[PDB]
């Protein structure tokens, strides 16, 4: 039976830019410590 509780996730371009910036900045910050 189809589920009434159905919804779709959305992510506008601003959220994509924020996420990419966040992950790249975290990688930049932690690369020196990970490589040691």
């Amino acid at each position: 039976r189809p589920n009434p509780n159905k919804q779709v996730v959305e992510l506008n371009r601003t959220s994509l830019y924020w996420g990419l910036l966040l992950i790249f900045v975290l990688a930049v910050l932690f690369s020196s410590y990970i490589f040691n």
Partner: peptide, 30 residues
Amino acid sequence: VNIYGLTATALFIIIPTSFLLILYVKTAST
């Protein structure tokens, strides 16, 4: 220079990037 550091950095760069691209494409198509 260790393989573990390079592979961890590569995975951390790529996997969230792929996830975010998936979500953004889903949003833009709708």
